[PDB]
Amino acid sequence: ASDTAVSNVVNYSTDVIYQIVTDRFVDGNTSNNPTGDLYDPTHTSLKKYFGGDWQGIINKINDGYLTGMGVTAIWISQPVENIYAVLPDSTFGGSTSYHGYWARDFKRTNPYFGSFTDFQNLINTAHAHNIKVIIDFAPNHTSPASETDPTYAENGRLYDNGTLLGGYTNDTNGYFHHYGGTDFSSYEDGIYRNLFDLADLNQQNSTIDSYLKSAIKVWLDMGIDGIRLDAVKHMPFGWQKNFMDSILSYRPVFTFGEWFLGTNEIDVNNTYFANESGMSLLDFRFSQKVRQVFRDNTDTMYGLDSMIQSTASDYNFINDMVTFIDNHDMDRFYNGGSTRPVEQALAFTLTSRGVPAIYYGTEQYMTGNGDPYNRAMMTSFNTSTTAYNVIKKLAPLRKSNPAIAYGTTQQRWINNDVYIYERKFGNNVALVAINRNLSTSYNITGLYTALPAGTYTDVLGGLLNGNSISVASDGSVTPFTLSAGEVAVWQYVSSSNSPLIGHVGPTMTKAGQTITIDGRGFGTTSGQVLFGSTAGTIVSWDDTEVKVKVPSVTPGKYNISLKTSSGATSNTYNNINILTGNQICVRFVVNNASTVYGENVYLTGNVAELGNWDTSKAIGPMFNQVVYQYPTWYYDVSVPAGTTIQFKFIKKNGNTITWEGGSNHTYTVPSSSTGTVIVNWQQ
Template sequence: MHRRRCRSALVALGALASLLVPTVVAAPPAAAAPSGTKNVIANLFEWNWPSVASECTSTLGPKGYGYVQVSPPQEHVRGNQWWVAYQPVSYRIESRKGTRAQFQSMVNTCHAAGVKVIVDTVINHMSGQDAGGTGWAGSSYGHYNYPGIYQSQDFHYCGRNAGNEITNYNDRWEVQNCELVNLSDLKTESDYVRSRIAAYMNDLLSLGVDGFRLDASKHMPAADIAAIKGKLSRSAYIVQEVIYGAGEPIGPGEYTGNGDVHEFRYGKDLARMFNNERLAYLKNFGEAWGYLPNGSAAVFVDNHDTQRDVGGVLTYKNGRTYALANAFMLAWPYGSKTVQSSYTFSNRDAGPPSDANNKTSNTTCYSGWECEHRWQVIANMVGFHNATQGAGVSNWYDNGYQHIAFSRTGKGYLTINDEDSAVNGRSYYAGLPAGRYCDVVHGTFSNGSCSGPVITVDSAGWFAANIPAHDAVAIHVGAKLS
């Protein structure tokens, strides 16, 4: 009987080398025009602004990422934990990640590299600090008092439970009018509150921001978000955080009229296939699984919340398996893709590498910062994604278990062998033009040559390859050798 194996959370570094070695390919800066097929998002979670700017130039632009998502930029409560950024005390663009001037410079630099900027935007609530205090930039605040911005009449007081907390997610009113973990809940049905939120977002738009990830969207009625969106000074990409809960009255589908919505089931189910079930089941992964429509779904293997709070989700700690899951996501035509880029943590609340004053340190990849977006297989599969945009899936193959393969018709081919042993001596029908292609899982294509193995597709569209255990091969028309 075929059975799944147990995996260690961490894989020996030597065994990962071929998949995880970062590479940066020099390329001329692209124009900050519409990104077209370059639409993969890199979520540089808790990176400071100078480091984001540098990464846009050195890696994100050259590797073909279309967007960078940055963490909340507004003034927040003091502390080192990651979640302090999600407790705003004012709408000043000054935080432990940098000043307003540094933020502006970052946006300009990323645009010059052809990378658009999405801001993680906290608009459902303010802080969760009962005693109040002084924020990062010196603003005083109370739990329901933010001088010059909000006072007590601008918040919800649900009065149902101790501390106004949400306790019943099967009650729509409670989820949208009570407090999420003591965070003072803004009265988003108020036109005054909507206008203040829109003013903050318009300030970000004036700095050149291209889009917003709306945090805690589930805790605001979709109509309130629509009203705030209607007050924006220009169009912007919108993606909303709405966590699916089985049987709950508030579902992600009701928010699609405002923009994209995170499909949280995607990462959980993908991990389940890799960890416990069969990759063969992924043949119809997407809408057929009851997910959001393809054109509205935003997907990821993990994000900053799920990597801490959702058991079984694949993260950087899963090494090779995590790399393969991201390769599948970037090759499979469902949803808009976000690649998570983390820092190393061993406890849930741990903040990013910082100085003694809790100011976020400059990023040094692989030294406290995981930088998954640079891992060779992930970064190179962004190019695969860009080269195969618009192509359907064909030539699906599976062995019934953990070995799968498929074409993006006429443009690319991926095969993943997640069995415990190699698959040797077989050929694959890629349906690609005859020629020599760089295997972008194990090598980087640059200036017409490949730093790794080369796959030869014959005149009938076939190629032969041996696939080691827990490994993959990927080829595409954008990495065809001359």
């Protein structure tokens, strides 16, 4: 098959996701609408159900709105059952689960969004039209709750396909966390404490780990093509890594979590998570910078480039980064006045690296600063808007030009207002020019490009004032004037191709599994795929896509390369994580581990999942506030199930590594449930 086929659920680099808040899009069926205080037929009470549903989404696919726009994927609200309680809101006089983030039963659907048959209708309709379906999923909590007053809301109660498990109050089984609420003081604090008043699920509890793992398979069984994990910054990395493996070994689908980063914010945990969790992240570094430059004027084009550059050094898999300019949590990008800024932001996002996600109603210039004003009902479905057409013209390039989907990015010209960059994947090239200044034109001289000598017209057809250009044999471009607010896109798509890997998914595997290598020039007759210098088993070989079975190599990260039947060797795609086996989440605890000021305790050990004795890649720094207090440290770690591990704890700083004394601690990871090991620091 092809890397662009709707069936390639492990690669979204050639796609454009359209984010829909189900309730605020289209009420395709009035018979399923809530009744009473839960519903607001006038669409004025922003926190009540307005009636949007899966049938309405289906309607926009069949009538050509979404398709006509060039959308290849849709990300919808969490489909699971939510609480029916209407909470008190002083401002909006009513607060409901219209958003779908207040889970009640993860094994059932929200009656107002539709039945499982309705959900299926949607999945089948999307696919029939070559559209992938992404679902929001929030395993961090259930719903708003007061353990002191079980009368408030539905007590954060959790059901298992109808049968109640328990609520926040009198939680004798310990399904939830009872450490009060987070004040975001630390990474650990925001994990084991509640997000505001939402009942915190305790996924270290065996029953909870199993429920969640079994609940996700329910949806995978429904045919979904991707998952959006909510608040991945508020759950342990160890559990999530273990949860990711559970998904990937069942039926691998592109997965990306939400790890909010503020303006100018960079978090080394965020980077580490994106690189080791087995899942991808939404680019908040991208999004925030983009808004600083095109929307709020708190930064220039030099900051847009530093982001492009730094972001490419920190992320092992930048082609997996989900980019956006706004969402259900941010103020709507269009703030009034000129719409050029949004239009330029959309073009820049659409031609840049990663996976473009577009918040619904952007193409319609919808405005709204703050939740919930930024979640108003779909205004209109007008296809004349410049925005709608920028997407129409740009979206398809992600399937037609490998450079745009997988290529690197390079700044070819720049000043405070102008950004000219190049996307390159072998001989395929894409060059983009953007002038953010709405009142000043620039004379572009000294511009060079990888585009072949020739005359190139604007892909946008002058939609954003772009024009054609002429390139010489030496790559030089004839001087041209970039008008105010101009965006021009020029490209070259090679006819021939040497073997080039532009993508590999999933990034976290195990021997015996199958991975998909995507690119160009692979050939039609099978060659060879290598994990290091070890050849794997070809499951299927095509010019743009190759599927292979992971050889039984020593667990760890491997660099992939491919050799054509003509002996042509490709480029390598590095850092694919081959695990020891099925993952299990174990909580490691160490007592009496006292440290001097600014010194932390980490976990190193026998397996790859533990860093194989490499103190530089040791697990930590471990936690020591919520669950257990210093000097006892603990950490939730993903480890190979049913394996006997030798490990030791250490105290690190920057210029001292103190190892535990005595002999390595031993433990045999449990086969099916979560586990806990407790030991005392050995002198």
